[PDB]
Design a binder for this molecule. Structure first.
Ligand code: GH3
Ligand code: GH3
Ligand code: MG
Ligand code: MG
Length: 370
């Protein structure tokens, strides 16, 4: 049978090389992130100035709106400009004091932070940067002091101003963040908005929600970051590799949608924690993962953040048809890895395993007899 260890891990031409970004590419994403950060800083500063002038100069609501229409708030729709005008006009002294005193902070969460960001594969897919905006403020036991709509409209202001001023830059509203899509760079940047104490305890990291009936959700991304980094320590460095590969498999099977990265990561560490394996043997390890992955999602995948009320993926008895489509797709993986392994020719093995991870590795000479 064929060994795929070099298919997976060979420098420059192996799968990890096709997935992982170079320093040049990473620096590009950082530069793109910096553009969004600086603009959001500007927007917050512009808003803060008007927030100052409100109580300072006893402004009318109209005077507030007209000032905001000299800033980046210009690019919101009329109702949104009026709404932000009202919010800044009528924010309480305590909330106003916080807003004026503190600048927003920026910290990246997700795969760009714990190094699992893959290159995109299908034409529509994009590299994903999760850069959160954090506002220091009084955070009571019940909720943050500053209204969630205000902060969300300031994020929208930033991204919509970037959209309006740049071609290829398109704003998209998600449930948990504002997203700016940069077509020319095959990159989009997710901007979740957070409220945090100004005095960071994870029990006070509040995420501002954009859809539904709940305004805030206590969700510290640091918890997932800490959990995954500790998992890499516990299981071994090959965890990032096998997580990258599974995400690559997901990107190959789904142009859009499919199981989330977090659920994939959690399922993999659950397997690798439970089952004895050889980290150095990526061929066997990936085969182990593929075999057991559907049963993990059948068992249900609980969030590594215990504060979450719902699991990342329900138990089988709670699976809807969309869940089943995912699991049945997962069941297909193990068969692909074994057919490749038992392919009669070397070029046949490559084409077969590339049905799982997509045509990225093209060098059949990486495949060696076991
Ligand atoms: N608690 C919790 N946190 C989530 C969930 N989904 C995303 N997050 C937070 O958002 C961060 C980024 O999420 P994703 O963009 O979907 O995954 P990723 O790690 O960045 O991988 P990818 O390259 O595919 O973007 C990681 C995690 O802290 C979730 O369902 N529950
Ligand atoms: N902190 C935190 N961020 C999340 C969570 N879920 C999603 N996000 C942010 O939203 C981004 C994509 O959101 P989706 O909507 O799931 O697409 C990725 C991540 O940065 C979460 O549960 N907690
Ligand atoms: Mg991400
Ligand atoms: Mg994202």
């Amino acid at each position: 049978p064929w060994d795929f260890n070099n298919y997976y891990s060979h420098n420059m031409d192996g799968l990890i090389s096709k997935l992982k970004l170079s320093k040049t590419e990473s620096d590009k994403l950082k530069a793109l992130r910096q553009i969004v950060r600086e603009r959001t800083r500007d927007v917050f500063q512009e808003a803060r100035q008007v927030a100052i002038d409100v109580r300072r100069q006893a402004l009318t609501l109209e005077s507030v709106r007209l000032k905001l229409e000299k800033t980046n708030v210009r690019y919101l729709s009329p109702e949104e400009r009026a709404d932000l005008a009202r919010l800044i006009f009528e924010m309480e002294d305590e909330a106003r004091d916080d807003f004026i005193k503190f600048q927003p902070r920026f910290w990246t969460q997700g795969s760009f932070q714990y190094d699992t960001l893959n290159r995109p594969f299908h034409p529509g897919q994009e590299m994903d940067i999760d850069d959160g905006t954090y506002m220091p403020m009084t955070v009571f036991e019940s909720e943050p002091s500053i209204g969630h709509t205000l902060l969300l409209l300031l994020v929208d202001t930033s991204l919509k101003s970037l959209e309006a001023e740049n071609d290829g830059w398109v704003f998209e509203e998600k449930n948990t963040c504002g997203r700016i899509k940069i077509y020319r760079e095959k990159t989009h940047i997710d901007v979740p908005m957070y409220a945090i104490p100004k005095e960071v305890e994870s029990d006070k990291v509040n995420l501002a929600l954009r859809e539904g009936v709940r305004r805030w959700s206590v969700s510290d991304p640091k918890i997932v970051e800490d959990w995954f980094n500790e998992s890499c320590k516990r299981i071994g460095g090959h965890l990032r590799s096998v997580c990258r590969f599974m995400k690559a498999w997901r990107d190959a099977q789904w142009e859009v949608g499919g199981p989330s990265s977090i659920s994939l990561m959690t399922a993999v560490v659950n397997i690798l924690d439970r089952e004895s394996h050889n980290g150095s043997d990526l061929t066997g390890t990936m085969k182990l993962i593929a075999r057991l992955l559907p049963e993990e999602f059948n068992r249900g995948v609980e969030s590594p953040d215990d504060t979450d009320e719902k699991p990342l993926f329900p138990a089988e008895s709670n699976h809807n048809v969309h869940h089943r489509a995912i699991v049945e797709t997962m069941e297909g993986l193990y068969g692909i890895l074994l057919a490749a392994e038992q392919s009669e020719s070397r070029e046949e093995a490559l084409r077969k395993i590339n049905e799982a991870f997509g045509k990225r590795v093209t060098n059949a000479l990486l495949i060696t007899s076991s």
